[PDB]
Design a protein around this nucleic acid. Structure first.
Lengths: 55, 93, 50, 211, 100, 117, 50
RNA sequence: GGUCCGGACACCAUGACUGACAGAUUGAAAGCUCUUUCUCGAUUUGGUGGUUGGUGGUGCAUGGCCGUUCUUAGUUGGUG
């Protein structure tokens, strides 16, 4: 019933198994080093994280 | 939301004991990291009811609800849970 | 080897039951299914699947 | 635990960013300015730089205690391992975030855009900043959006010295018509003592030892 | 025994300050100190599209974080470690001791 | 003694032991200390039903004529900031699985309803 | 109010259960099983008994 | 095609209301519905306000960001 039908489908891999940690979006996700931030989340948070535009 | 009275019991007990409660915005999770027995959905909905009744103060950031017990909440929870007036949440201590 | 699933086994059972409950002169009742990844095994041969 | 140093650095950065965002969303009324994280392996110290430590701490330091509990529970620390300390920012007029929130509050209250912007500009300039730029953009007058810029003093834009001398902040205000964006930039003054501004002078400013 | 001091930081100046302080402490206590060994720096690069949409000229932001690591070898069985390690400390530098 | 009964019932209700449909299952476990009934139960086959099971399992009972007062004897009504009994429901029967407040009176009512039975 | 339908009050005064009581390890006396046409279904549990 | 409310809170209401064996049913082990009568029992259910959610419209209502004009040397007060 509902118990075994609400979220039956596995979400172990693929784009649907991950999300930006700030907006919960599946598109353009940076997984390098376990950042788990979208390409738009990261541009805003990079200075706080410790990344800099050197060259 | 339909929640067992026992589950509401544990939720209120933890909230009063700690003074604060945190829950990730994940309805599907079946286990709250801090409160045992109840599901993330039940925790979220119970504390959302508290916030709507102004018994708790709600904040949200980066897919995470934070909730602070208020004075209306401290009165309501004590009267509902039937504790002595001497017991107080860890935050007030 | 990885194993047919419970829904697939239920479909096989349904088709076999429909085939049994049908005279040779006529055709078995049609069994409607969503399972497009089911393997066509001899158990299903003869039956009518939608 | 056993975690590579790369992942340790990234985890520390993520933690600091999330903490900064949460405190910005919470203590905005308390004149929040910033946060510093000294995550010693034993205990994680978190300094909350605000303009008014009174409100941050709350009655007998209850608000800070609540925040410590919430941070511990959210980030999975151990009871008493993480500790918050309030701090009073020296010069509020030289902190762009604090002035941005002040302008936010004035605009929410209903002060005229020009009046509030000029008041903030004058206060920041009297606080000793070399220059200040305040931009308020959105539906300020009518249906068509417009951006109003207020400038006084001198301000640099290009080159590395920007990273040291310029301090910026951005905020939103939701009024009936829509959202309005506030941007505040402050060029800090050259402070040899390194309290009101950068310790090193501008690279092109050659200063002469008088004979 | 060989005590290994691993000091890692994302900024060179505080890291070298702390390293010099530890070296000075060891020399003052007249310990067998092995000079600061400089591990190759680790550069973490993220290159992203600047636009939040797909429009415009294709421009990329190149972000990079640097990590510098320093090794110090000490032959100190006495608790002079506790002192030299406790006195010197600075934000942004993380130090760890190993009993190699 | 009504106040003592109400105080005893309050703690049981808080402890989630205070309980018709549920009352039967309570005394089938013989976890019931006592039951409170009403003489206003019009259903004749209903009144005698509850007394027999209470008697059969050795769980003597207290009879309070009208039902609406037992409804008040739960705390299940909403108040006008003064304990004002508002919008109560029938409580033809109830059970107390676990003991409650009024320890001294609770001691009295244990002797009271047992001594006279 | 079918609660009274699973109890027969003997004329002398004692009672006899009119429904097959359940025998699950957890749920026992009190909880009754449905008087289905061919089976008997526990409500608190599954425990179908034909 | 089908399922769940994950419709807070307030107000007025009328064992309120959940859940699941088996047959039927369904793509379906979906108590979704119908046969069936069991079970937790104030959280619910109906209605009225109000919320909530929406990768729904509007980028010609907006913020922020980016692109471009424009990778060129170009631009602005004060006092005269």
């Amino acid at each position: 019933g509902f118990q075994n039908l609400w979220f039956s489908h596995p979400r172990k891999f693929g784009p649907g198994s991950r999300s930006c940690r700030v907006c919960a979006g599946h598109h353009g996700l940076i997984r390098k080093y376990g950042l788990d931030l979208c390409r738009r989340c990261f541009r805003e948070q990079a200075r706080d994280i410790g990344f800099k535009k050197l060259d | 939301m339909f929640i067992p009275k026992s589950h509401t019991k544990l939720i209120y007990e933890y909230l009063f004991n700690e003074g604060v409660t945190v829950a990730k915005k994940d309805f599907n999770a079946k286990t709250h990291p801090n409160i045992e027995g109840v599901s993330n959905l039940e925790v979220i909905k119970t504390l959302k009811s508290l916030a709507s009744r102004e018994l708790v103060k709600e904040q949200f950031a980066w897919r995470h609800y934070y909730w602070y017990l208020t004075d209306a909440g401290i009165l309501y929870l004590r009267e509902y849970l039937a504790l002595p007036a001497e017991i107080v949440p860890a935050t007030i201590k | 080897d990885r194993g047919l699933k419970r829904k697939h086994l239920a479909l096989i059972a349904k088709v076999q039951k429909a085939k049994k409950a049908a005279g040779v002169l006529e055709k078995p009742a049609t069994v409607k299914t969503h399972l497009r990844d089911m393997i066509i095994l001899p158990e299903l041969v003869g039956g009518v699947i939608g | 635990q056993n975690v590579t140093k790369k992942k340790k650095a990234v985890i520390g950065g993520i933690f600091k960013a999330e903490l900064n965002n949460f405190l910005m969303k919470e203590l905005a009324e308390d004149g929040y300015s910033g946060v510093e994280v000294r995550s010693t392996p034993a205990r994680a110290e978190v300094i909350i730089m605000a303009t008014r430590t009174q409100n941050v701490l709350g009655e007998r330091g209850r608000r800070i205690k609540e925040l410590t509990s919430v941070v511990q529970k959210r980030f999975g620390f151990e009871e008493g391992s993480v500790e918050l300390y309030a701090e009073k920012v020296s010069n509020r007029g030289l902190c762009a975030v604090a002035q941005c929130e002040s302008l936010r509050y004035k605009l929410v209250g209903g002060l005229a855009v020009r009046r509030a912007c000029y008041g903030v500009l004058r206060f920041i300039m009297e606080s000793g900043a070399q220059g200040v730029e305040v931009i308020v953009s959105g539906k300020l007058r009518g249906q068509r959006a417009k951006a109003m810029k207020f400038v006084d003093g001198l301000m640099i834009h290009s080159g590395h010295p920007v990273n040291d001398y310029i301090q910026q902040a951005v905020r939103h205000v939701q009024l009936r018509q829509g959202v309005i964006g506030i941007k505040v930039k402050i060029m800090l003054p050259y402070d040899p003592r390194g309290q009101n501004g950068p310790r090193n002078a501008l690279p092109d400013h050659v200063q002469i030892v008088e004979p | 025994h060989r005590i290994r001091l691993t000091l890692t930081s994302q900024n060179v100046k505080p890291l070298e300050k702390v390293c010099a302080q530890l070296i000075d402490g060891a020399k003052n206590e007249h310990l067998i100190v092995k000079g600061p060994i400089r591990m190759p720096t680790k550069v973490l690069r993220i290159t992203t599209r600047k636009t939040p949409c797909g429009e415009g000229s294709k421009t990329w932001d190149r972000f990079q974080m640097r990590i510098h690591k320093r090794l110090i070898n000490l032959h100190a069985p006495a608790e002079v470690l506790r002192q030299i390690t406790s006195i010197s400390i600075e934000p942004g530098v993380d130090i760890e001791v190993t009993r190699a | 003694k009504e106040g003592a009964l109400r105080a005893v019932l309050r703690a049981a209700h808080h402890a989630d032991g205070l309980a018709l449909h549920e009352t039967c299952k309570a005394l089938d476990k013989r976890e019931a200390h006592f039951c409170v009934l009403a003489e206003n139960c019009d259903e004749p086959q209903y009144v005698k039903l509850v007394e027999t099971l209470c008697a059969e399992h050795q769980i003597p009972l207290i009879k309070v004529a009208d039902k609406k007062i037992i409804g008040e004897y739960c705390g299940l009504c909403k108040y006008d900031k003064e304990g004002k009994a508002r919008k109560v429901v029938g409580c033809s029967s109830a059970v107390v699985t676990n003991w409650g407040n009024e320890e001294q009176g609770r001691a009295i009512l244990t002797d009271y309803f047992a001594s006279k039975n | 109010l079918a609660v009274l339908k699973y109890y027969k009050i003997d004329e002398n005064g004692k009672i006899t259960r009119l429904r097959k009581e359940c025998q699950q390890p957890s749920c026992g006396g009190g909880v009754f099983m449905a008087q289905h046409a061919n089976r008997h279904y526990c409500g608190r549990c599954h425990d179908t008994l034909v």
